[PDB]
C-alpha cells in the first residue's frame, strides 16, 4: 500500500514503479476511478444534506405543503440510494486497484527480470572432489536417509527424512533459532495458518494468492512464510518509539502450493509443499538510515549462519521485475549446488519501507510525539529441507557419508552422518 | 475393517462389540446385505455357466430345439443383466457398511463410556509448594512467554510462544526424537498432509472426518497425527518376516479442527488447532503375544519420558465406549495439572490388532511363507504445547520462573527458564 496523496501528487514516480516492476496496472484508470469516487461522495453528501433540510422542514409544515415535502423527501431519498449504491461499487473497485500499486524500487536496482540480477559478492568456493561426487538424491538413496514411499501417501513435492538426516533437519532449525537468539532477535514458535487480513498485510494477497493453500470451510489459509504471522502481530497498535526496532526470529512450518512450478525442481529437497523455516523480521522507524542498517544486519546474520554451516555462497542484487510489488530492495543469498554446477537461492532479504505497514496498519510514536507508519524488513534465517541439498553435496565424503560442520557437532552429537541401516 | 469370514462365523461378538463401543451399526442388515451379495455372485456364476453353453450349442441345435435354447439364452441374458446391476448397487452399500464395523474390545476393558475408565496406577506425588502456585497461563503472562496477539492473526485456539518457552518447545521435541532413537525406533520427519486413502487406512475416515481439516482445491487433508502417514507408508508391500517389528518414531506438525465441543477446556496450551507431536508407531506380526509385547514397550517409553521430565502421572485403562471403533486396547497416560486439581491426558497408547492393517493393506510374509495382515500399535512419544502446561505448573519456583528437569538441561543450556523482560 502506497500513500494515495503521493499517488495523486506524483503519479509519474508510481508509473515508473509499475513499468519497471512489470505490474499489470493502469494508473490513469486508477486516478480517474478515484476522481469519480470523490465526485460521487460530494453529490451524495449534497443529497444527504438536502434530504436532512427537507426533513427539518416537515415538523414545521402545514398540510398542503407537507404533502409536497414528502414528495420531495422521497425523490431525494431515491437519488441518495442510487449515489450510495454506485459509490459502494466504485470504492470497492478502487480498493482492489490500490492494493496492486507497487513501491518504487531503490535507484540502484537492476532493471529487467531475473536476467538483470547481479552478483554482488562471492565467499567461498565449490569444493575440489578427489572422487566422483554424488548428488543429494543419490546420497539419500545410498544411505537410506529419505523415504520415497511418502510420494504415494502425500503426493509429489513431498519428502520424509529418516535416521540421522531426520535428526540433522531438527538440529539445523534449533541451531538457527539459537544463533538468532544470541544476535538479539526474540525467538518465537508460531502457527502456520492465518486469516486473510494477515496476507493482505504483507502483500501475499492479492498478487501471490495462487501460491497459498486455503484450509477448506474456514476463513484460514496456510502461510507460506512466518513473515505473514510476524507482520500481523501488531496491526492497529501504535508502538512506542523506544520499542524500535522490533526484531523477531520466528519459526513455523511453511506450506506453498507451488502453482506454476511445472517441472521445476521436481527432484529432491529443493521445492517442496511443506518445509520448516526460521524467519528474521524487523519493524523499525520510518527513516532510510534505519531500514539500511537493519537490511545490512539481516544479511550479515544469514552470511554468518552460512559461514558456520561452512557453505559457499554469493549475494545477488535482485532486479526490479523480480523483487515483487512491495520491495524497495532485495538481495538473495545463493549457495553452490555441485550437481547442478550453479548457485541456488537459500535466503531472500527484503526492505519494504512502509508498503506493508500501510496495508497491515503498523504504526509507532516517533521521538516528537508524531504517529507514523513503521518500515518493515525480513530475511530468511534458515529453511530446511533445501539447505540439506547443499550441505549433503558440499560435505560428502568418499564413502558417501556426509560430515557435519564444526558448529553443528554440539547439536548432532557426531561429526559424520551415518547410513540408516 | 474386520475379517468378513469371522464376521459371519461369529456375529454375536461383533454384535456385543457394536453395543459396548456405542457404534451406530445395524449388524443384522449388514449381514443380510452380505448374504444378498454372496447369493447374487453364486447365481450370476450359474447363469454365466449356463449362458455360455446355450450360446455355444445353438449353432448345432435342430429347428424345434434351436428355438427353445434361443429363448432360454435370451432369458438368461436378461437375468444376467439384472443380477449385474443388483450386485453393483448392493456391493457398494456393503463396502460402506464394512468400514464401520468395530473391532472387539479386549476382555479386560471396562464397559461403558469415559465414565467407566479405570486408573491402573499413579506414579509420583503432586508438587508441594511453599507459596500459592500460579497456573500456566499466569506464568506465561507474567514472564512474557507467549504472545496473546496471535488470536487476532489466526483466530481462537492458536498459541505463539516467545523467548525461553519457544526454545523449550523445540528442545522437548528434539529430546523425545533422541530418546526414541536411543530406544531402537527409527527417527523420521514427516509431512502433515496426506491423501484420503491414508485416513481410511487408520480409521480416521469415515468416523472422525469432521476432526480433519481439508486443503481446499486439492485432494489432500492435514493430518491430526503422524500415525496417518506412518501407517500408510507400507500400503501394498509384503514385508519380509525379518523386518518385523517395524519401530518408527515420526515427528510432524498436527492440525486438528477441534470441532468437537469448542468451549471444552481451552484457553492456554491444552487444545489448539496446530501442535507438534513425536509418534511411536509399531507394525508387528499377527500374534496377540507380539501386540502385547509392543504395547508394553510403547507404554514404558512414554513412562520413561515422563520420569525424565520429572512429572507425576497415572495410567488409565480406557472403556469400550471411549476407545474408538478400531481399538483392541487403549491406555491413556495422564499428568497432574496442579491448577485444575486433576490429571489431564498427555499420551494415548492403542493396539489395533489388524483392523488398520486390513484397511491400509499391510501384510507380511510369515515364517511359513504365508502372507498375513500385520498388527499395528501406536503411542504418543511427546506432544507440545500441552506438555508445557503441566511442566510450567509443576516446576514453577517462588519468583514465577520454571526450572528445567535434569534430563533437559543439555537441551536447554540452562537450569531455569527466565522472563523475557
Ligand atoms: N517450496 C520450497 N521448498 C523448500 N524451501 C523453499 C521453498 N520456497 C521457499 N523456500 C525457502 O525459503 C526461503 C525464503 O522464501 S522466500 O519466498 O524466497 N522469502 C520469504 O518467504 C521471505 N519471508 C524471506 O524469508 C527460500 O530462500 C528457500 O530457502
Ligand atoms: N488439539 C490438541 N492440542 C494440543 N495437544 C493435543 C491436541 N489433540 C491432541 N493432543 C495431544 O496429542 C496426544 C495424542 O493424541 S491422540 O488423539 O490421543 N492419539 C493419537 O494421535 C495417537 N496417534 C497417539 O499419539 C494427546 O495425548 C495430547 O497430548
Swiss-Prot record, chains A, B:
This is Serine--tRNA ligase. Belongs to the class-II aminoacyl-tRNA synthetase family. Type-1 seryl-tRNA synthetase subfamily. It comes from Thermus thermophilus (strain ATCC BAA-163 / DSM 7039 / HB27). Catalyzes the attachment of serine to tRNA(Ser). Is also probably able to aminoacylate tRNA(Sec) with serine, to form the misacylated tRNA L-seryl-tRNA(Sec), which will be further converted into selenocysteinyl-tRNA(Sec). The keyword Calcium does not apply. GO terms for cellular component: cytoplasm. Transmembrane segments: none annotated. It is found in: Cytoplasm. Homodimer. A single tRNA molecule binds across the dimer. Its EC number is 6.1.1.11. It catalyses: tRNA(Ser) + L-serine + ATP = L-seryl-tRNA(Ser) + AMP + diphosphate + H(+); tRNA(Sec) + L-serine + ATP = L-seryl-tRNA(Sec) + AMP + diphosphate + H(+).
